[PDB]
Amino acid sequence: KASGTLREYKVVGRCLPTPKCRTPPLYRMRIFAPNHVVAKSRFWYFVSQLKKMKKSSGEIVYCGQVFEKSPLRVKNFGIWLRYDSRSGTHNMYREYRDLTTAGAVTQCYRDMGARHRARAHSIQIMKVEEIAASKCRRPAVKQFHDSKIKFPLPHRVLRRQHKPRFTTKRPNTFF
Amino acid sequence: AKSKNHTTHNQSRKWHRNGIKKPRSQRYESLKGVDPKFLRNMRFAKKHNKKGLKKMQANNAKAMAARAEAIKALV
Amino acid sequence: GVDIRHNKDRKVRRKEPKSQDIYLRLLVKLYRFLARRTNSTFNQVVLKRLFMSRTNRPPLSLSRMIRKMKLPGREGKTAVVVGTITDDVRVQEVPKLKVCALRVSSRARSRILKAGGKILTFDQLALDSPKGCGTVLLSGPRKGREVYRHFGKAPGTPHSHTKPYVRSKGRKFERARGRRASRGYKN
Amino acid sequence: TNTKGKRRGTRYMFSRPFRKHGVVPLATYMRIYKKGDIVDIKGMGTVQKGMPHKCYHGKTGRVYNVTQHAVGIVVNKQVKGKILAKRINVRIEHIKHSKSRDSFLKRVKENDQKKKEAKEKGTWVQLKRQPAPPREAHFVRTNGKEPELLEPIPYEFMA
Amino acid sequence: FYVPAEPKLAFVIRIRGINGVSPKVRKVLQLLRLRQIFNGTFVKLNKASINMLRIVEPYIAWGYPNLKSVNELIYKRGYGKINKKRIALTDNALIARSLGKYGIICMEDLIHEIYTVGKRFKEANNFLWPFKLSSPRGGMKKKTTHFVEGEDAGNREDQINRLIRRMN
RNA sequence: CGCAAUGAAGGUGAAGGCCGGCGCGCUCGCCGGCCGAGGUGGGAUCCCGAGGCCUCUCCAGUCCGCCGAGGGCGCACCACC
RNA sequence: UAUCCGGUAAAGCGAAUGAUUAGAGGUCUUGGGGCCGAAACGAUCUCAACCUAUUCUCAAACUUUAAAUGGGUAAGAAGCCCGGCUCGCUGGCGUGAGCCGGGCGUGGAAUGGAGUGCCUAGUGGGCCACUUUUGGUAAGCAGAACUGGCGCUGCGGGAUGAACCGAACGCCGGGUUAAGGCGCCCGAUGCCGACGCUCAUCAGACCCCAGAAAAGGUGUUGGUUGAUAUAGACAGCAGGACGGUGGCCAUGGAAGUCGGAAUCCGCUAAGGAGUGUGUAACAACUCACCUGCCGAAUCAACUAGCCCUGAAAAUGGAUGGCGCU
RNA sequence: GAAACCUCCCGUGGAGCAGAAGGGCAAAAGCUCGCUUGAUCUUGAUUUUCAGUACGAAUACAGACCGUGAAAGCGGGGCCU
RNA sequence: CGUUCAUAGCGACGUCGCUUUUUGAUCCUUCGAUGUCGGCUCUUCCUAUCAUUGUGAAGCAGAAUUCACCAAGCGUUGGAU
RNA sequence: GUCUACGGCCAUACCACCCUGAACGCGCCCGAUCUCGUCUGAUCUCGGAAGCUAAGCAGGGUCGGGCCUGGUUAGUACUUGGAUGGGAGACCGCCUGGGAAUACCGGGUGCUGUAGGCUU
Ligand SMILES: [Mg+2]
């Protein structure tokens, strides 16, 4: 796995039928990935671990992108992880605040790279669950839960440093 | 002044320049190394095939006539 | 960059004859033309043979030419031979033949013509039959040359029957250690 | 540099399997090889007369000669750059019929059945084999019950 | 659920060069006629064929071509093998002359034989000289790594069509 | 030098078949006639060739091709007997 | 696609061989030493080997199992199916072989024109990388396997460079790429690039590669697990820390206190038969439970990111340089 | 008497098979008897080392002359390396 | 261990490192030759600091001291064999 | 239903103990004149047929051992191919395909060929 910005995918698949097992059970997952191609691969990786079931032994039935049903709501997402350290493998519960699951998992993948130099292929996302104002354990999230939120944008450092590469005016950063 | 002692390093390559050809199969291989007592007897059998020729030729003519009668009955 | 071996890209067959003689080269000019413009593959085979070496176009003996035309059905035909026709002193009665050859030896010439045979040159064969129709294309035995008796699995290599290059045959030229059982071993 | 001895390294190869020592049971001996039978060589420890060399164990080849209680058998042995078809005189006990050929003969027999019939009918039938084609279009009924969700399980250290 | 058919046919582009390449790979790559880098071929899929692609995975990018892909490849870079001389399919007199003994008498017929993988696929596909495509405009992601893991190699199924457009 | 070998040597030295008859046809011995370098598989090439394929008409109909299913003689060379 | 071959990885040792831990059980045997016995398979232990279930941990020269990769064959005209002849072999009759004479055609995928013979030079110092691998503390050491390199070979990248990555060269125009990049040196970010992390009085800055470890750090950032607290805590200051009791072993002195077996009750609001200081030994001091004030979170133990300590070499110096927050 | 000899039971070989080790071996390939000289004479073929040369060592036959066994058979040295 | 007290100073059984002023390994370079030990003489660098400056430590009362830090500016001698 | 003789495959067929066996068989059994052989008529050889299923043999039984076959162990261990992935190393993760072995828990516990009986 690598990235870009992910998309939730639904992928349901089954170990393909036999004489002995005529109508085998379907298994569904939530597989975040940049595209269906790697989605299906990622589906197979997770299933292999859990169930005696390989890409040869099975058929993916329905892979399909899943759309955030409330895009223009701001939400808080709890996300449970399973990363690999340099040392042992771990569990976490991260929390992000975003407009989407995909966005919230994407956000996670960047954080984990930042905070733990953890690369995609090491991380397992288990559950991603949207959450209330309460049931938010992280204070970095909790500070934005407030009705009359109010802050300034204090030392507003400029970009467009090469529109006028040279100029008479020393700039301004108070607004 | 010790050497390298043995290797097989570049050898597979060397072999496969010119193929590794399978051993050229013919029909009708020799009877060299076949159990002598056999070979005597098949030699003798071969000796006397010309004995019992006139019988054999007639038998084929009788067969050919039976084939010609069968094909006439079909048509 | 492409992967092909350029190893056997050049085919080594002859194109023209290596000889510089002018009469043969005229035959080549004639049979090139016929080869290309006729459908006859006879012309192609003949053309191919005009480029070959002396070794490679061995002499065809009169007796060999007899018996090959004695064969059932190729009767009232013409035998063709890009090599030379030689005599056989060990044949007597010579049927009346039709023959093409680049050469025929003076004896072989007499014997054939005395029989009522016709001899043809290759320019004459073309006018007579430009598509090689009604011909028997023969060849001399390629592996006649004493040369070949030294070729093969080497002498002193079990089950080879390959003449060794020896200065002179005789009691004491080879035939010791490696042929007798009494002397070392044998192959 | 290793020893050139005939039996070097056949500690395991020529060794009767676990609880199959003792008498060479008799079918082995009393089954008939003709000329041109495809036959796979497999040396055996109990019988040491007529043993093949360790190089021809595993190797399959054709029978060329049949003596009283052995079978001459041409087998191809590779040597660095050249494959040498060579003829070895194995005692029966080290030899089975190779089934490899029989599945072929079964198929040709089946073809001769399917060629005789389907001639008077007119409908020509697929005689050639064909590799496993891609697995066709089909429906899967999630009959009533929905799909089963699979969360990956949280790590824990067992040992 | 409607699980549609697994694909019949796939385009296979050789996406790395001709130096330091294992002998088993190299042989298969010259059984797909993928000698130069960025040559491509159509390839009918089946247990035999797919596994040959499995043995050359980090040497190729491949997958399931569109209809449009089969057209664009055939019209823009459609070259016959005609007396062993790579010759551009300028007219149907060329296709017919060679493939007309199969009922294939024009560029259009050819496209239908390639795309539906007909009876006469082997003979229409071999007739086509392997497609010399240019370099990938806009570049690649990574030559050496698999598609799934960010790179370009291996099966990318639907997405082989994007690559086709930026190379054809 | 080549056209004959093989044996250490004394020496010996490359034909067979068939048919009919006479000796018991004894897969052995002797007398008359005929063929005369054996046979299997593959073999470039020649040869024969059903049959098309038309001709400005309906049939007759020699001439000329083009192809040719099928079948033959089979060089060289190879493998086998 | 069928079909044989295998004894390496792994696994196993309540299966063999060999190794090896522990207790249960057993006068198996018997002993050697005991203690209580004159002595007694008497009682009681014990250690020896042996055994009955278990149990710990192993094997290049062990193994019941047993992969992956791997090596044979086979996938048709030299094949099938009929008819008849030959044999000095074989034989109750029949085998089996060899001959004639007919009858039947694409027999898995993909690719490619094949076969065959003669003359024949140079070479016979090698080395390097992935992976496997023997010797060795190790080596830019020595020795094998496997493929691919270098040698014979330029070109883009890796500042520099046999061998790394990319790619393999007729002589040129246009286009596009790879691997690598895009402050300036130096072609390209002079993007209003996105999200974090990190300040280093030794910062850090890209395969091969040219450099650091154990162990530490309320430095900062994430986790994990447990707490706690309105029965208003947590620290921050202030009040007590006893008696049954020189408790028992230890006397050389330990009444809580060199050590060790202990190790509970009372009063209780509550104080350990005691954290230390210190005493020859006490004493004296010091270290819960609770309040008074203050006013919301507090605190512990792990864990992993960057940063830091750990961190010493000789001409002046090298993320390539300039520099960069 | 821990060990002498006898007898009953259990005993997959934990013994033995000249020697190193590995394989193989139980109405045997072990032990004990009886009879023996196949450790004899003679062509080629093949395997193993291999260059696919030699040597040695071996394998299957074939022709003699024997051995042994009621016989089928086995035996031309040592169960195999 | 240091009366007492693991750590003022020490430090077993274990363990992780650096160094190339020891000696080995190794044999890459040089055998159409790179002058092979020591001393003298002279310059420069390193610090792993003996003294000297500034300081933390003690089982530092003073004196004497060892332990550590910044630190290589300046020194580090005369003789007998 | 089942046996005997000669078998094929060789434990689903072995071992232990327990029960039951009609008829025909198979046995044990009773003898040593002769054949044959022993220290010994135990074995071996031979001539029998009074007893008896006690034993062998068969069929069954046992929360039996063993063997055979499934599950689990486990997509775990291992592993083909890949990367300018990680990691100071040791090693590890991913991609691409392949994929075991105990303990533990189930089920099974001879099939059958030729020739001849018996249950008429
Ligand atoms: Mg050498």
Ligand SMILES: [Mg+2]
């Ligand atoms: Mg070249």
Ligand SMILES: [Mg+2]
């Ligand atoms: Mg690479």
Ligand SMILES: [Mg+2]
């Ligand atoms: Mg081994």
Ligand SMILES: [Mg+2]
């Ligand atoms: Mg192991």
Ligand SMILES: [Mg+2]
């Ligand atoms: Mg040299």
Ligand SMILES: [Mg+2]
């Ligand atoms: Mg060296």
Ligand SMILES: [Mg+2]
């Ligand atoms: Mg050189």
Ligand SMILES: [Mg+2]
């Ligand atoms: Mg490369």
Ligand SMILES: [Mg+2]
């Ligand atoms: Mg013996």
Ligand SMILES: [Mg+2]
């Ligand atoms: Mg004999």
Ligand SMILES: [Mg+2]
């Ligand atoms: Mg002390």
Ligand SMILES: [Mg+2]
């Ligand atoms: Mg040195």
Ligand SMILES: [Mg+2]
């Ligand atoms: Mg000098």
Ligand SMILES: [Mg+2]
């Ligand atoms: Mg210092």
Ligand SMILES: [Mg+2]
């Ligand atoms: Mg008796």
Ligand SMILES: [Mg+2]
């Ligand atoms: Mg009974």
